[PDB]
């Protein structure tokens, strides 16, 4: 087992978390493991912003390995920004450690209400170098160099709330997690984990659309026009100006997303993208889909996709591998 296993834990049964620690001593932190960003950031004791009151904060001075820096930074996400400065110290992922460069965030003001409302402390990126600020080598890519893991790849098995936890295996593929054969999809870029696939919903097809397998996104993102065309004949109710698309969970018109390559066919049925909203109305559900237009027609296969499919992100071969996750471990 020259490969880790960070037990992930469900957050409000949509997203999920996993820990890691900075500072040469322990200093544990809960992170959102983001295959959609390449920058590890942590709240510093120097944080002055309210968002930190609930967070675990980092003390460089309490850590022998702290290598200073201070280059101010601004980490921008599609959902928020977080400011701070670079610093270096050990990072203990699972049991493996390595001198890693990160960001000591001290202002979390532009990441609200998300931050104050969530239980994670930081965001640990698992993406490609070109997606990073300060050009940091990917943890898993650096670990391989550092002969700590043989294969520079990471597995993801999302926990299913009251069923089982999940795992972030680092360095190898555990069959315990997946059913059926794995199928590999070569990256179209070494940025995000972006593969190319044909999108097909009703008889709406956007062939060769960009597909970003992002674990940091709670929803399945869709090019706006696609969203607008998709929700036309269904009996879906969008509240004016709000990305709140309410359905009866039994709506027989609900489409089944279906992305395919010449290697495999991946589908996400209503069961995986719908979100029960019984408190609002009995028998009601919401889509968990968002209109979002990237420069080039992109879909974002977030938590819902990865929650059905066991995924393998391989830095060495430059591809993502999709297999069906095991309903239970």
């Amino acid at each position: 087992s020259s490969n880790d296993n960070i037990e992930l834990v469900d957050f409000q049964n949509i997203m999920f978390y996993g820990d890691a620690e900075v500072g040469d001593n322990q200093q544990p932190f809960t992170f959102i493991l983001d295959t959609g960003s390449a920058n590890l950031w942590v709240p510093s004791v120097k944080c002055t912003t309210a968002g930190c009151l609930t967070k675990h904060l980092y003390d460089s001075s309490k850590s022998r390995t702290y290598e200073k820096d201070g280059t101010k930074v601004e980490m921008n996400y599609v959902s928020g920004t977080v400011s701070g400065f670079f610093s270096k110290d050990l990072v203990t992922v699972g049991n493996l450690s390595l001198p890693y460069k990160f960001i000591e965030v001290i202002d979390t003001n532009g990441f609200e209400p998300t931050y104050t409302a969530s239980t994670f402390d930081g965001i640990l990126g698992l993406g490609w170098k070109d997606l990073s600020i300060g050009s940091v080598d990917p943890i898993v890519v650096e670990l391989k160099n550092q002969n700590k893991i043989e294969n520079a790849l990471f597995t993801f098995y999302l926990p299913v709330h009251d069923k089982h936890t999940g795992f972030l295996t680092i360095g190898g593929i555990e069959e315990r997690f997946y059913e059926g054969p794995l199928t590999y999809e070569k990256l179209n870029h070494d940025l995000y984990w972006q593969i190319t696939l044909d999108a097909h919903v009703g008889n709406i097809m956007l062939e060769k659309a960009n597909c970003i397998v992002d674990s940091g996104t709670s929803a399945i993102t869709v090019p706006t026009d696609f969203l607008n065309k998709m929700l036309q004949n269904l009996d879906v109710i969008k509240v004016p100006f709000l990305p709140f698309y309410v359905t009866l969970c039994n709506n027989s018109k609900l489409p089944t997303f279906e992305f395919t390559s010449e290697n495999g066919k991946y589908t996400l049925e209503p069961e995986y993208y719908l979100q029960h909203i019984e408190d609002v109305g009995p028998g009601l559900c919401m889509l968990n889909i968002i209109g979002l237009d990237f420069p080039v027609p992109t879909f974002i296969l977030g938590d819902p996709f990865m929650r059905k499919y066991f995924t393998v992100f391989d830095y060495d071969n430059h591809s993502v591998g999709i297999a069906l996750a095991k309903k239970n471990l």
Partner: peptide, 6 residues
């Protein structure tokens, strides 16, 4: 929701 880098 949360769509995570620019």
């Amino acid at each position: 929701x949360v769509v995570x880098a620019x």
